[PDB]
Amino acid sequence: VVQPINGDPFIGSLETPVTSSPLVAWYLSNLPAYRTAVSPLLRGIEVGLAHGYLLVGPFALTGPLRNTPVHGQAGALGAIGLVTILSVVLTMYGVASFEDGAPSTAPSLTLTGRKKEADKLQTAEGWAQFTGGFFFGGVSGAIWAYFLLYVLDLPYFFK
Amino acid sequence: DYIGSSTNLIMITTTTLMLFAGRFGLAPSANRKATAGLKLEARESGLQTGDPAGFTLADTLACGSVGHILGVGIVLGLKNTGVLDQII
Amino acid sequence: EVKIVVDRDPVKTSFEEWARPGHFSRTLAKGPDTTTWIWNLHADAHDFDSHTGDLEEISRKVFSAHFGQLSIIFLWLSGMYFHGARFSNYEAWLSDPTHIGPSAQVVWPIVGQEILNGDVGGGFRGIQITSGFFQLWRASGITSELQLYCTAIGALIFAALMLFAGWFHYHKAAPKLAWFQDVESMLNHHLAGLLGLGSLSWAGHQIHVSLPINQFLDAGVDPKEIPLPHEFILNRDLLAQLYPSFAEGATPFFTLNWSKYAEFLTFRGGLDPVTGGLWLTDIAHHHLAIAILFLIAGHMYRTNWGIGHGLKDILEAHKGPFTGQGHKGLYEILTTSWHAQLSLNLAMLGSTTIVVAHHMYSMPPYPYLATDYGTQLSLFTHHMWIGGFLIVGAAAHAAIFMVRDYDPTTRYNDLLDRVLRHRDAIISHLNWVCIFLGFHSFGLYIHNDTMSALGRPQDMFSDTAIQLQPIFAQWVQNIHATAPGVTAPGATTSTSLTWGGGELVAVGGKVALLPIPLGTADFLVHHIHAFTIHVTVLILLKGVLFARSSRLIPDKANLGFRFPCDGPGRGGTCQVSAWDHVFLGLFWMYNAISVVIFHFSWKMQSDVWGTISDQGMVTHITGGNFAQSSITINGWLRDFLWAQASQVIQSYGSSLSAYGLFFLGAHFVWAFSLMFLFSGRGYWQELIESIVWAHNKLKVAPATQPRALSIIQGRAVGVTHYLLGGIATTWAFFLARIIAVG
Amino acid sequence: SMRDIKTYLSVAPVLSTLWFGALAGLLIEINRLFPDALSFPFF
Amino acid sequence: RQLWFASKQSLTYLDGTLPGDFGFDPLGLSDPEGTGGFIEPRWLAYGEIFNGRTAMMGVVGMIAPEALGKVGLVPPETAIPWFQAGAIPPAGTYQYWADPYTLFVFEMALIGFAEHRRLQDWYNPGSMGKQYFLGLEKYLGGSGDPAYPGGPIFNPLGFGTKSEKEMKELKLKEIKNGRLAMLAFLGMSLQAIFTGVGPFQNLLDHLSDPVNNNILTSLKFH
Numbered sequence A: 001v002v003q004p005i006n007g008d009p010f011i012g013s014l015e016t017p018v019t020s021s022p023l024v025a026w027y028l029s030n031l032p033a034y035r036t037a038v039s040p041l042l043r044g045i046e047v048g049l050a051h052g053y054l055l056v057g058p059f060a061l062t063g064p065l066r067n068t069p070v071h072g073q074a075g076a077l078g079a080i081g082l083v084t085i086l087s088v089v090l091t092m093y094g095v096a097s098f099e100d101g102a103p104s105t106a107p108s109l110t111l112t113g114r115k116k117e118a119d120k121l122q123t124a125e126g127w128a129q130f131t132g133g134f135f136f137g138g139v140s141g142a143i144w145a146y147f148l149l150y151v152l153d154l155p156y157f158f159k
Numbered sequence B: 001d002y003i004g005s006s007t008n009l010i011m012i013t014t015t016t017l018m019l020f021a022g023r024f025g026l027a028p029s030a031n032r033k034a035t036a037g038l039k040l041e042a043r044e045s046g047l048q049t050g051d052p053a054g055f056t057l058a059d060t061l062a063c064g065s066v067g068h069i070l071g072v073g074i075v076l077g078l079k080n081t082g083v084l085d086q087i088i
Numbered sequence C: 001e002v003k004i005v006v007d008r009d010p011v012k013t014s015f016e017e018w019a020r021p022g023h024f025s026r027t028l029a030k031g032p033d034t035t036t037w038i039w040n041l042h043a044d045a046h047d048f049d050s051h052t053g054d055l056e057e058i059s060r061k062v063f064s065a066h067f068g069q070l071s072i073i074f075l076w077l078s079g080m081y082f083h084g085a086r087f088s089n090y091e092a093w094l095s096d097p098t099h100i101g102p103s104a105q106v107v108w109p110i111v112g113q114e115i116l117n118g119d120v121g122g123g124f125r126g127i128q129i130t131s132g133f134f135q136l137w138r139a140s141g142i143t144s145e146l147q148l149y150c151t152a153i154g155a156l157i158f159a160a161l162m163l164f165a166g167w168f169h170y171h172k173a174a175p176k177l178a179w180f181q182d183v184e185s186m187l188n189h190h191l192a193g194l195l196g197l198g199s200l201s202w203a204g205h206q207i208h209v210s211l212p213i214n215q216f217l218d219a220g221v222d223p224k225e226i227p228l229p230h231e232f233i234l235n236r237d238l239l240a241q242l243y244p245s246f247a248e249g250a251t252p253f254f255t256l257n258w259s260k261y262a263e264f265l266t267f268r269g270g271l272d273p274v275t276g277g278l279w280l281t282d283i284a285h286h287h288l289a290i291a292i293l294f295l296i297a298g299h300m301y302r303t304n305w306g307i308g309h310g311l312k313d314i315l316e317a318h319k320g321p322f323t324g325q326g327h328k329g330l331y332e333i334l335t336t337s338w339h340a341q342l343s344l345n346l347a348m349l350g351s352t353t354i355v356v357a358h359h360m361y362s363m364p365p366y367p368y369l370a371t372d373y374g375t376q377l378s379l380f381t382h383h384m385w386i387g388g389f390l391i392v393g394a395a396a397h398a399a400i401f402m403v404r405d406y407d408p409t410t411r412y413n414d415l416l417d418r419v420l421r422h423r424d425a426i427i428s429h430l431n432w433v434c435i436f437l438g439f440h441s442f443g444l445y446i447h448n449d450t451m452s453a454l455g456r457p458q459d460m461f462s463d464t465a466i467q468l469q470p471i472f473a474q475w476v477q478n479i480h481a482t483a484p485g486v487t488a489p490g491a492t493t494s495t496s497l498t499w500g501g502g503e504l505v506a507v508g509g510k511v512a513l514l515p516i517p518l519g520t521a522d523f524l525v526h527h528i529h530a531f532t533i534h535v536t537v538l539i540l541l542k543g544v545l546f547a548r549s550s551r552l553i554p555d556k557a558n559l560g561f562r563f564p565c566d567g568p569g570r571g572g573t574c575q576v577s578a579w580d581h582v583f584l585g586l587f588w589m590y591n592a593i594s595v596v597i598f599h600f601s602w603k604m605q606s607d608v609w610g611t612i613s614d615q616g617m618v619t620h621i622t623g624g625n626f627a628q629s630s631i632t633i634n635g636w637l638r639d640f641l642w643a644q645a646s647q648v649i650q651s652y653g654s655s656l657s658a659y660g661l662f663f664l665g666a667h668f669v670w671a672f673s674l675m676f677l678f679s680g681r682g683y684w685q686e687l688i689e690s691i692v693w694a695h696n697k698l699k700v701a702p703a704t705q706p707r708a709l710s711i712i713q714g715r716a717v718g719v720t721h722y723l724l725g726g727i728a729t730t731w732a733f734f735l736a737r738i739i740a741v742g
Numbered sequence D: 001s002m003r004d005i006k007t008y009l010s011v012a013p014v015l016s017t018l019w020f021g022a023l024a025g026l027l028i029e030i031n032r033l034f035p036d037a038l039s040f041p042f043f
Numbered sequence E: 001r002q003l004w005f006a007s008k009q010s011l012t013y014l015d016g017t018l019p020g021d022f023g024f025d026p027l028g029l030s031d032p033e034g035t036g037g038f039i040e041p042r043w044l045a046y047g048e049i050f051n052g053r054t055a056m057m058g059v060v061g062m063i064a065p066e067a068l069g070k071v072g073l074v075p076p077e078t079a080i081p082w083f084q085a086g087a088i089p090p091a092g093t094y095q096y097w098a099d100p101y102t103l104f105v106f107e108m109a110l111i112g113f114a115e116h117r118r119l120q121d122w123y124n125p126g127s128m129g130k131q132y133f134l135g136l137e138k139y140l141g142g143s144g145d146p147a148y149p150g151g152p153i154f155n156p157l158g159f160g161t162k163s164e165k166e167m168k169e170l171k172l173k174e175i176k177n178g179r180l181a182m183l184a185f186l187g188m189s190l191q192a193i194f195t196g197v198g199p200f201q202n203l204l205d206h207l208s209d210p211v212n213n214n215i216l217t218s219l220k221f222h
C-alpha cells in the first residue's frame, strides 16, 4: 500500500495510505485554504469565524477569573485580544513575503501534470484580503460563541 | 488398589492413542514433517530401525511423553472440576 | 551433524609474548614513539574483531575469556563466604535479628582508623553491611561457621577449575566454527539443562533443607540445638513430625495424589507475619512449576533425530503481507556477527534487572529483609544502576554492527531496509513527542512554583486545587486488590500488600509493607519519567540509524565507528560519529535513573516506612509530607535534599565518618570531570611544549615523547569521572541517611 | 624461561606495584613504631 | 554380527575391527573427527575395559562376606553387608587394626606407585624395562598394547599362547564378563539405597516369595 509519490521514488518522500488515499485528498481539497478558484476574502472569513469560535472556551474556563460572575466576558475579551495579535502577525508575514506586483508563487501543476492557473492567495493583494477577512471573521465568531453561551444560556454539557 | 482405577485407565488410553497417531501417519514424526499443522510431509529419520514404517526409538518417546502430559492434564482437570474424586 | 569437533594444540604455551607488549597488534608490536602508544595498548586490548578477520579465532578467544570471568566471580564468592565465616557476628545475629546490625568487615588499628569498628551489637565491633548476605544465608538453613568455611573452600576449588578449563579449551583443544554455530542444540541445553535442572535442584534443596531448619528457627530454638541438615535425610521420622505427608513417600507423586502434599506446597500469597517475607512453601511450589516449564521448553528445536522446529524455517515461514517476506535473512545475520547478538542480549538482561529491582521491594523474598531499610534501599538502587548501564551498551554494540557487519550485497534483509528508508519520519516524530512531553510535564512544576510564590495556592495543580488524578492506575490497583475470590479463586491473598485491601504487617515494632496511595504528585512524577526515557531513546536511536550516512556526511561509514569529527567545514561537524551518540546518551541515562531513585526514596520514607505503637498508631519517618511538598521544585530542594543531608554532614567523629569523607571526595571527582568536558586538546599540547622545553634544559627529556590525550580519550575520561562522582555522592548520602535514621 | 620471566617482572606496572607495596609497608611500620608525630624531637 | 541401535554415521567407523564390536553409538562420541583430550577411541576402549575389570572384583568382593558368613564359615561379627564396612561411616563401621584414614594413605602410596608406573607405558611403550627396579625391570617390558600387557608377570601360565582366534574369543569373553559386572555394581548400589539390607539377603526374599517386589519398595524408607 506504500508506493513512490507519483511514481517518482527519488523525490524526498514516498506515498503512503496517509498521504495518497482519496479520502484524505477529498477532505483537504474541500478546505477553504485549498479553494484556488474562490476570492481570498471569503476564504479568510471562514477561517476567522471557525478559529474565533473555537478560541472562546479556554479563556472562559481556565483563566484567573473563572470563579467570578464575569468569567464569560473575560474569556471573550481574551479571545478577541488573541485574534488581534494573530491578525497583526498575519499582516507582518504578508508584508515580509510578497512584494507588490510580483506573480504568484503557487504551484501550477497537478498530479497528472495538467497546468493550472496559479493561486491568487500568494500575492500582495490576495493575502491582504485574506487577512482582513480573518480579522473580521474572528471577531464575529468570538461574539457569536459568547452570545450563544452566556446570553441566551442554552441548556450545554459542562459549560 | 491403584490398578483399574479411573486415573490408571486414562493414562493408558492417552498413551496408546498418541502412539497410534504417531505411528500410523496421523501425526508428525521423525520421518514425517509438518509446516502448517495439517500438512503431513515425509522426512528421513536417519537412524536404523527395525520397524519398516520409519518409526524410530527417538520417535516413540515423543508421543509417549505427549500422552503422559495430556493425560495428566485431563486427570487433574477432572479432579479439580469436581467430576472425579479428589483422592483415589 | 551435531558433533563435537576440535583442533589439537592450536597455540603453544610460552612466556615469549609476555615480554613483548602490543604483540596482538601489527602497529603496536614495533614499540612506542610517543606516550599515545601506551594508551592505545590498553584501549585495543579486548577488541578481538580488529585483531584479525577470522571468525573461528574470535570465537575461541571469546570462549576462553568467558572462562576467565567465571573464575574471577568464583573468587569473589569464596571471599564473601570466608569473611562471613571468620570476621562476622552472624551467629549472634541468628538469635536477635531485629536488634543486631549485620557486620562482616573489620579493620586494623593504625593511624586511628579503628574508630570505624562501630558498636553493631552482640559483643562485636565492625562495619555494618547492606548487601543482604545474612538474610540469604538464614534462608538457606545455614547455622554454623564451619558450613560457611566449607562453602568458601568449595568456591576456591571451583575458581581453580574455571581457570584451568580456560587454559585447556584455548591452548590444547579448541572447538571448530561448526561447534559454535549449533544454536538449536545450545538453546536446548541452556533452556533445559541449565535453567530447568537448576531450578529443580534448588527446589529439592528447599524442600529437604530450608523449610525444616526455618521451622525450628521460627519456633524459638537455640541455633546450636537444631538438628543437623543430614539428620532430616537419614531419619524420616524427624521430618515427618513436622510435615505428616512425608510418611507416604513419593507414592502420591506417581499415583497422581498430589493434593497430599498441600502441607508444604501452598498458594497462599501475602507475607509471613513473623518474618515479614514470602511463605517458603509458595517459593518451593514456584520453583517446581518453573522447572517443569523450562524442561518442557527445552525440547522445541531439532538436533539429531529429525524432530523439532528449525530456527531458519520459523523465521522464513512468517513472511509479510507488505509485498515481501520481511523476516527472511535474519538467521544468517544472527549466526555470523557477535556484535548483534551482544546488542540483543545486553538489552534483554538490562531490562530484566530493572524488573528484578521493582519486584524485590514489593514482595520481599527473604526473612527479616523488609524491616532492614538500608538493605532494601541498597538492593533497589544497585540493580537500577546496573540495568541502565547494560541498556546503554546495547545501543553501542548495535551501532558497531551497523558500521562493521551490515552488508546488503551478501546478506540482505527486507525489514532493515524498510526501516532505513523512513528514518526522517521516525526521528522527526520522536523529536516532536519529546518536546510535547517536556512541556506538559516540567512546565506544570514551573507553573506551580510561580503560583505558590505569587500567593495564589488555589490556582495550583494539587489535591486541594485543580486535581489531576491518575484514574487508570487506581483502577488497576482496585482490580488487583480484589482479585482473590473471583478471577483467582485458588489464592488466599493478593500478590502484594501495596495493591490495597487495608492491612499492615509489622515486625519488631516496624512497618514492613502496607497499601500505597496515588495522587496528583504521582501523576506528575510518572510523566516526568516518561519524558526522560523518551529523550534517551531519541538520542540512542539517532546514533544507530544514521551511523552509515546522512544528508550532511554521505560517506560516514568509511570514517568508522569511533572518530572525533570530519572537520570545521559544512558549518562544523563535531560529534557526528555513533560513539559520540553513546557518549551523549550516558548523561541522559544518569538523569533518568537519578530521578527514579529519588522518587523511590522520598515516597517510601514518607508513606510506608516507620514505627507503630501498641495501640496501632503509625508514625512515618518524614510524616507524610510527599503529597503536598513534592509538587514544586522548591519542595524537592528544601524538604528532600537539605532536610535529609543532615545525617551525612553530621557524621564526623562517629563510626559513619567514612561516608562524610566519601561525600566530599565524590563532589571533588564530579567537579574534576568538567575540566575535561569543557576544553580541547590544542591548548594542552601547546602547554606541554613549554614544559618539555624546561625538561630539555636539564637533560631530562624522555625518549617517549609526551603528547596530550586524543579528542576521543578526552571525552571518555570526562564522562567516566562525571558518572563516578555523581553516583558516589548519592551512594554516601543514601547509606548514611538510612543507617543513622533507620 | 628464566630470561623471559625476569624480563616480564621488569615491566613498568609490575615494578611500580612492587615498589609502592614495599614503600607502603615501610611507612606503615614506621607509623606503628613512632605514632602521632607532629615534629622532630630527637635534635 | 547383531547390530544394536546402529546409526548411519556410526557404521562408518564401526566395522568390527575391535573385540566386542556390535555398533551401538547413538550419540556419536566415538566419531573420528575432532579428537582431543580424553575423547579418543583408543582411550575410550581402554577406559571401558579397565572400569569393567575393576568392577569385576568389586562386585565379587561385595557378596562373599555375607554369603560365606551365612553358610557358617565366617564369624558373625565380620559377616556384615558391604556398605557397613567403614567406607560409609554414617552406615555402620568396624574397628580394624590401624585407622580408617591411615589405611587410606598406606593404600594410596602402593596404588599410586602402580598407577604412575602404568601410565608411562601408555605414552611411550616399553619404557619401563630400562631403569633398574631391583631386578624386575627385565620382565616389566610390555607387548605393544597397553590394554593387554602379557608377559611372565602378567601371564605366568600360557593360557593365551599357540593360537590367535582363541585370543579374540578370550577378549570377547572378558568384554561380556566385564560389562555384566558394571551393571551388577549399579544394581547393588541402588538396592542398598532403596532397601538398606544386604544384597545377598535381598535375593532370598524374591526367591522364596516373589511378592515384595519393587512396587512395595518404592516408599523409599531410611
Ligand code: CHL
Pocket: E004, E014, E018, E019, E020, E021, E022, E023, E024, E025, E026, E027, E028, E029, E030, E044, E045, E047, E048, E051, E179, E182, E183, E186
Ligand atoms: C564405562 C562406561 C563405558 C564406556 C566408556 C563405553 C565405551 C564404549 N562402548 Mg560401551 N561403554 C561403556 C559402558 C557400556 N557399554 C555398553 C554397551 C555397549 C554396546 C552395545 C556398544 C558399546 C560400544 C562402545 C564404544 C563406542 C560407543 C561410544 O560412543 O563410546 C563413547 C561413549 C561414551 C564414553 C559414553 C560414556 C557414558 C558414561 C559412562 C555415562 C553417562 C551417563 C549415563 C547416561 C547415566 C549414568 C548413571 C549412573 C548412575 C550409572 C566405546 C568403546 C560400541 C562398540 O562398538 O563397542 C566395541 C557398541 O556397539 N558399548 C554397556 C552395556 C549396557 C555398558 C555398561 O556399562
Ligand code: CLA
Pocket: C062, C063, C066, C067, C070, C179, C180, C182, C185, C186, C189, C190, C192, C193, C194
Ligand atoms: C546442559 C549442559 C550445559 C550447561 C550446564 C552449560 C552451562 C553453561 N554454558 Mg553452555 N553449552 C552447552 C551445554 C551446557 N552449558 C552445549 C551443548 C554447548 C554447545 C552447543 C554449549 C556452548 C556454550 C558456550 C559457547 C558458552 C556456554 C556458556 C555457558 C555458561 C553460561 C553462564 C552461566 O549461566 O554460568 C552459570 C555458572 C554456573 C552454573 C557455575 C559453573 C558450573 C559448571 C562449571 C557447569 C559446567 C557445565 C558443562 C556442560 C560441564 C561439562 C563437563 C564435561 C565436558 C567434562 C554456563 C556455565 C558460556 C560461558 O561462559 O562459557 C564458559 C559460553 O560462552 N555454553
Ligand code: CLA
Pocket: C431, C432, C434, C435, C436, C437, C438, C439, C442, C443, C446, C535, C538, C539, C584, C587, C588
Ligand atoms: C537544565 C538543563 C537543560 C535543559 C533545560 C535542557 C533542555 C533541552 N534539552 Mg538539553 N542538555 C543538557 C541540559 C539541559 N537541556 C545537558 C547538560 C546536556 C549535555 C549532556 C544536554 C544534551 C541534550 C541532548 C543531546 C538533547 C537535549 C534535548 C533537550 C530538549 C528536550 C525537549 C524538551 O523538553 O522541550 C521542551 C522544553 C523545555 C522543557 C525547556 C523548558 C521550557 C519552560 C519550562 C517553559 C518556558 C515558557 C515560555 C516559553 C517562556 C518565554 C519567556 C520569554 C521572555 C522568552 C530541551 C530543549 C533533546 C532535544 O532536542 O529533544 C528534542 C536532545 O536531543 N539536551
Ligand code: CLA
Pocket: E108, E109, E110, E111, E112, E113, E116, E117, E120
Ligand atoms: C626430587 C624428588 C622426587 C620426586 C618428587 C619424585 C616423584 C616420583 N617418583 Mg621419583 N625418584 C627420585 C626423586 C623423586 N621422585 C630419585 C632421586 C630417584 C633415583 C633413585 C627416583 C627414582 C624413582 C623410581 C625408580 C620411581 C620413582 C617414582 C616416582 C613417583 C611415585 C608416585 C607415587 O604414587 O608415589 C607414592 C609414594 C608416596 C606418595 C610417598 C609415601 C611416603 C611414605 C609415607 C613413606 C613411608 C616409609 C615407611 C615408614 C618405611 C617402612 C615401612 C614398613 C614398616 C611397612 C613420583 C612421580 C615411581 C614411579 O611411579 O615411576 C614411574 C618409580 O617407580 N622415582
Ligand SMILES: CC1=C[C@H](O)CC(C)(C)[C@H]1/C=C/C(C)=C/C=C/C(C)=C/C=C/C=C(C)/C=C/C=C(C)/C=C/C1=C(C)C[C@H](O)CC1(C)C
Pocket: E024, E025, E026, E027, E028, E029, E051, E052, E054, E055, E057, E058, E059, E061, E062, E082, E085, E087, E181, E182, E183, E185, E186
Ligand atoms: C570390593 C569392595 C570392598 C569394600 O568392602 C567396599 C568397596 C570398596 C565399595 C568394594 C569395591 C567396589 C568397586 C571397586 C566397585 C567398582 C565399580 C565400578 C568400576 C563400576 C562401574 C560402572 C559403570 C557403569 C554402570 C557404566 C555405564 C555406562 C553406560 C550406561 C553407558 C551408556 C551409553 C553408551 C554405551 C554409549 C552411548 O553413546 C551413550 C550411552 C547410551 C549413555
Ligand SMILES: CC1=C(/C=C/C(C)=C/C=C/C(C)=C/C=C/C=C(C)/C=C/C=C(C)/C=C/C2=C(C)CCCC2(C)C)C(C)(C)CCC1
Pocket: B060, B061, B062, B064, B065, B068, B069, B072, C292
Ligand atoms: C516391541 C514391539 C511392539 C511393541 C511395542 C511397545 C509395546 C512399545 C511401548 C512403548 C511405550 C509404552 C513407551 C512409553 C514411553 C513413555 C514416555 C516417554 C513417558 C514420558 C513421561 C514424561 C516425560 C513425564 C513428564 C512429567 C512429569 C515427570 C511430571 C509432571 C507431568 C509431566 C507429564 C510433564 C509391537 C507389537 C508394537 C511391534 C513389534 C515389536
Ligand SMILES: CC1=C(C/C=C(\C)CCC[C@H](C)CCC[C@H](C)CCCC(C)C)C(=O)c2ccccc2C1=O
Pocket: C675, C676, C677, C679, C680, C681, C684, C685, C707, C708, C709, C710, C711, C714, C715, D016
Ligand atoms: C587536563 C587535560 C589534558 C592533559 C592531561 C594529561 C596529559 C593526563 C596526564 C596523566 C598522567 C599524570 C601522565 C603521567 C603518567 C606516568 C606513568 C606517571 C609516572 C609517575 C608515577 C609513578 C608517580 C588533555 O590532554 C586533554 C585533552 C583533550 C581534552 C581535554 C584535556 C584536558 O582537560
Ligand code: SF4
Pocket: C564, C565, C566, C567, C568, C572, C573, C574, C575, C711
Ligand atoms: S573543534 Fe575539534 S571536533 Fe570540532 S571540527 Fe574542529 S577538530 Fe573536529
